[PDB]
Amino acid sequence: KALQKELEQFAKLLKQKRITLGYTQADVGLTLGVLFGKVFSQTTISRFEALQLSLKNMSKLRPLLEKWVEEADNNENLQEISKSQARKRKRTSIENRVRWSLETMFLKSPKPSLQQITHIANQLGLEKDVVRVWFSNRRQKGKRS
Amino acid sequence: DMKALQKELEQFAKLLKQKRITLGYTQADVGLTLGVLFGKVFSQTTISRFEALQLSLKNMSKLRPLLEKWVEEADNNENLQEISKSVQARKRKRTSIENRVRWSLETMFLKSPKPSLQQITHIANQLGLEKDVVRVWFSNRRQKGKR
DNA sequence: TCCACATTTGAAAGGCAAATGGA
DNA sequence: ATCCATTTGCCTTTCAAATGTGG
């Protein structure tokens, strides 16, 4: 009642501004990195502008985007030349074949140990912390429904 | 053979994804480093569609040589490719108009399909868009009709 | 230059789940 | 290291902007 009033107001303000200045959602997210050392994918930026993020997350992100706006209203060009060194935030994509191998291994063994994870990692050309996290999420998909 | 191309194209496209993923590059990344290598950036959508043989056969083949070369490059120089950006370009803007404008552009429809120089002037400055955009818009809208 | 109509091409948003943070 | 929740982005895809060609 209090937040989603002023948040809904800001979302409209960021979209119009973004479009006025001819920026795309990726651009903004990518320039957030240039300005603040903390880059953001267009997905994030679209969810912000659409209010699909949780309230805390909107609130955590408002100060960055507020800061972005007030930068764009003056030196718009030196942004359009600074963005287009990484604090990226990777997300591993795994090959359909490799994601299925891991599937086979699960459901016959839902909670492997570190001694399994290691062989599986080098076997499929993956880092170990990937396979490890993979299993935990796969388990969480189980307990989901 | 008409299908002998699609055999070679499907094999390349499979190699391209295989290479892209193992080397850890996203599709945005690839499309951007064509910008870097040939002078024209391509979007993730373009690369995604290329990887899925989603494009027309003619289109696939214009792109293929660029993508082949990217594979050829990315096997070795990997460090200096990701060290560039995370130079432009030139490529490739697309005006995303606001919803209010589009609707108030749709109003002249189905009022008048073929505005002519006079109407194209007024609407451009009023809605704060180049007069090129408006002409194009009214053309595109006309084609959606006949479709 | 304009127009038809064919064709290339990308911003944005949905699906799902990878990575992260807290206990 | 786990489980659990929550943050977050890759890939996808729709719809149309832009661009190409021939009149």
Side-chain angles (χ1 to χ4, degrees), chain B residues 41-43 45-46 49 56 59 94 96 114 142-143:
Chain B
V41 24
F42 281 106
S43 60
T45 300
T46 298
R49 290 174 164 152
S56 89
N59 197 353
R94 169 187 152 98
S96 57
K114 209 168 295 186
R142 285 194 284 275
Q143 313 193 42

Side-chain angles (χ1 to χ4, degrees), chain B residues 20-39 41-57 59-61 63-67 70-71 73-77 80-81 87 89-90 94-97 101 103-107 109-110 112-115 119 123-124:
Chain B
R20 200 178 53 71
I21 298 206
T22 318
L23 269 24
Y25 291 92
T26 60
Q27 292 168 339
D29 286 331
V30 168
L32 209 84
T33 60
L34 295 190
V36 180
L37 304 193
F38 311 109
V41 24
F42 281 106
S43 60
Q44 18 176 142
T45 300
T46 298
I47 300 303
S48 183
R49 290 174 164 152
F50 186 89
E51 287 201 331
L53 315 207
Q54 221 80 88
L55 299 162
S56 89
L57 242 69
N59 197 353
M60 300 290 296
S61 292
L63 278 168
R64 179 168 187 249
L66 311 166
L67 271 358
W70 176 87
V71 164
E73 295 293 318
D75 291 325
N76 319 60
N77 304 316
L80 236 318
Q81 279 186 344
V87 189
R90 304 130 308 278
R94 169 187 152 98
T95 308
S96 57
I97 48 266
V101 164
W103 174 249
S104 55
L105 268 165
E106 244 274 337
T107 316
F109 233 106
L110 209 15
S112 81
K114 209 168 295 186
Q119 289 90 303
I123 317 168

Side-chain angles (χ1 to χ4, degrees), chain A residues 41 43-44 47 54 57 91 93 111 132 139-140:
Chain A
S41 73
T43 299
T44 296
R47 289 170 173 159
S54 72
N57 204 7
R91 172 185 173 101
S93 59
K111 206 183 297 180
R132 205 196 72 240
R139 286 191 285 273
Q140 283 182 246

Side-chain angles (χ1 to χ4, degrees), chain A residues 23-37 39-55 57-59 61-64:
Chain A
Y23 285 97
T24 63
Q25 295 178 329
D27 279 344
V28 173
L30 201 144
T31 56
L32 280 180
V34 163
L35 304 194
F36 313 111
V39 92
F40 277 100
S41 73
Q42 55 91 207
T43 299
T44 296
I45 294 315
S46 181
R47 289 170 173 159
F48 195 96
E49 282 183 351
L51 269 25
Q52 254 130 12
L53 297 179
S54 72
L55 291 89
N57 204 7
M58 303 280 318
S59 304
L61 265 155
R62 198 185 182 209
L64 285 177

